[PDB]
Each structure stands twice: as structure tokens, then as C-alpha cells.
Design a protein around this nucleic acid. Structure first.
Ligand SMILES: [Ca+2]
Ligand SMILES: [Ca+2]
Ligand SMILES: [Ca+2]
Ligand SMILES: [Ca+2]
Length: 291
DNA sequence: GGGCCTCCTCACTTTCTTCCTCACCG
DNA sequence: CCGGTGAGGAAGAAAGTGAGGAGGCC
């Protein structure tokens, strides 16, 4: 079983709370409602999904294309397990806002209002604030209101951070040919990325870890944040000890382990030698996108 | 025994991850 | 010169979010 705070951190990273409201003339109200918690990952991390499944004793795992796998809970009885966990171990990103709307939608269905016109209206109102909001077909049918409270929580513990890092983390080794010379540049880099909507939370990492900085990235109108640590003494003294104690999950754990081997070589200045570089070069082949 | 629920196959957009380059300073 | 560091941006796919179909529960 996964540590429950590791689980929440991972959920804040890769989870999704979904409210479906579908047209159907076979329903008395004319709409069929479905409430879904979902985690979609690459097949290489199917084991995480299976362990969450056994930990919660709920949910179904299905394939999605040739390289992806998906764990979903939508059975109404089984959804109490989801709410139970996330009440006891609350999300801290803006996704918590989706969970609370998810939660309200559940209360509507629990008293069975989704089977009435008054409830469907309420559900549409809820869905409008969730994720990507109302469809065009749904906006047409329901011209009424277009926002939710901003979530402002701090990092609860390093077990959450471990779960969140197992999702959004990057353990990288940069190599490049120096402009003036024949030497190869070497940089160990740690990274956590997130949409700019959680700028406060991402800023909170500089304080919480006692190192690193934030870089603002964008493509046209799309923008995100990358928390990076490139100070090696910080990585060696602050970053690595954290995840040695608080174990990462999935393939990213393996990436971290190789990453630490590179960190050892760099600690002993062997990245400056010819043979140490090709050892590092060999490790890169084993890790990340190369795994 | 009609709605109603649940689980399947399946697909859209983008938020992540990964990778690359390089000027600067001490 | 040289190595360490931080800042930039490119590429694209592993994510996030959500689609229709339908068997069968109660
Ligand atoms: Ca995420
Ligand atoms: Ca991930
Ligand atoms: Ca992610
Ligand atoms: Ca690439």
C-alpha cells in the first residue's frame, strides 16, 4: 500500500475529478450524470495504479491507446472511499477546488436530485466551475452564470512532496559542448513544474527547501513555472537527503537513483575526468526519456 | 422492467517533463 | 582559461480531461 500523503501528493499531480452531464432521451430529466475520479499514466507506471487499487479496494484499470493506462472510480458506492481519503488527506493545489465541487456534486446525487430538474440545474452550475467548464452544447441549453475560491494551502509534509515530485519532478543531467574550448559542460539539475495558477505554492518551495529558484516559461499564451535547483551543494545537502528519507514512487524513483550516482561522481570531481564523463554519459542512456 | 447505473472503448487539448544552449563571474 | 551557476527557449508526449456505446442491475 502507498503512504496516504504520498498518494495525495501524486493525486495533486496526476489526478482528475470529473463531472459528466450527458444528453440522453432515455432519462426522465433527459440527462445522465456520472461522477469520476481518474488517474491516467504511461504504461511504465501501471504498478502505481495497481497499488492504489489494492490500497483502496476500489476502481477499475483500463488501457488507453498503446502507451497509456487509466485508473477510474465512478461507482457511486466506491466514491465514498475517494471522499474519505481526500477529507483525511486534503489536496493543496488548485485541484482541491475541483475536489470540493466534485464533493458538492456528490451530495446532489446522494439525495438523488440528479434525477430531478432542480438538481441537474445545480449540477450544471457546479460543472461550470470544474476544470474546462461547460461544453458549448451545455451553455446553449443553460444560459446562466460563468469562478471559484482560490486555494491557498502550504506544503503539509515531505511525504506529500514525495508524491507530488513522483508526478511533476525532473531529475536531469545537462551536457553540452563549451563554446570556447573542447570541454564538456556538466550540470546536475532538479526540477518541479506547474501551471502558473499555483505560483504561490511553487514560490513556497524556495522557502520550504531552503534553495532553488523559479523560472517563468511560456509558449504564446500558454505559460508555466519551473522550480529549479542547480546549486550542487544544495542538491547534495538539501534535495537528495529529502527523497532518500521520503521515497519516491514509480519510474521516477529509478531516475532519482541514477541521478544520485551522477551526483556521487560529481561530488568527487570525476565529471572533470575523461572516464567519469563517459560513465555519466552511460548513466544518461539508462534514465529519463532514455528508459 | 424502465429508467438508471456502471464500465467499456476511445479521443481531444495541453501541462507538464525533457532536452539544449550559453553568457557570466569569481 | 575554467568550472559552477542561472537564465533563456524548443520539442512533444505523458499527462489531464472528457467522449460515445451499451450490457444489465433493481
Ligand atoms: Ca499536474
Ligand atoms: Ca508524471
Ligand atoms: Ca504530471
Ligand atoms: Ca524532446
Amino acid at each position: 500500500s502507498i503512504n496516504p500523503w504520498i498518494l495525495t501528493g501524486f493525486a495533486d499531480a496526476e489526478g482528475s475529478f470529473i463531472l459528466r452531464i450527458r444528453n440522453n432521451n432515455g432519462m426522465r430529466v433527459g440527462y445522465l450524470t456520472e461522477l469520476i475520479f481518474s488517474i491516467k499514466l504511461h504504461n511504465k507506471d501501471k504498478s502505481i495504479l495497481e497499488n492504489i487499487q489494492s490500497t483502496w479496494k476500489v476502481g477499475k484499470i483500463t488501457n488507453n491507446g498503446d502507451q497509456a493506462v487509466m485508473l477510474r472510480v465512478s461507482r457511486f458506492e466506491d466514491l465514498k472511499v475517494i471522499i474519505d481519503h481526500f477529507e483525511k488527506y486534503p489536496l493543496i493545489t488548485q485541484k482541491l477546488g475541483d475536489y470540493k465541487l466534485f464533493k458538492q456534486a456528490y451530495s446532489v446525487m446522494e439525495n438523488k436530485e440528479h434525477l430531478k430538474e432542480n438538481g441537474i440545474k445545480e449540477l450544471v452550475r457546479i460543472k461550470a466551475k470544474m476544470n474546462w467548464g461547460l461544453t458549448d452544447e451545455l451553455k446553449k441549453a443553460f444560459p446562466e452564470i460563468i469562478e471559484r475560491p482560490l486555494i491557498n494551502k502550504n506544503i503539509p509534509n515531505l511525504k506529500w512532496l514525495a508524491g507530488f515530485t513522483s508526478g511533476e519532478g525532473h531529475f536531469g543531467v545537462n551536457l553540452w559542448k563549451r563554446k570556447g574550448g573542447t570541454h564538456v559542460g556538466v550540470q546536475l539539475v532538479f526540477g518541479i513544474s506547474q501551471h502558473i495558477r499555483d505560483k504561490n505554492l511553487m514560490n513556497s518551495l524556495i522557502t520550504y527547501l531552503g534553495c532553488g529558484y523559479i523560472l517563468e516559461k511560456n509558449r504564446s499564451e500558454l505559460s508555466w513555472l519551473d522550480f529549479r535547483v542547480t546549486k550542487f551543494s544544495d542538491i547534495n545537502d538539501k534535495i537528495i537527503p529529502v527523497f532518500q528519507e521520503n521515497t519516491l514512487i514509480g519510474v521516477k524513483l529509478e531516475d532519482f537513483e541514477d541521478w544520485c550516482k551522477v551526483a556521487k561522481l560529481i561530488e568527487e570531481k570525476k565529471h572533470l575526468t575523461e572516464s567519469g564523463l563517459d560513465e555519466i554519459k552511460k548513466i544518461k542512456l539508462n534514465m529519463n526519456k532514455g528508459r
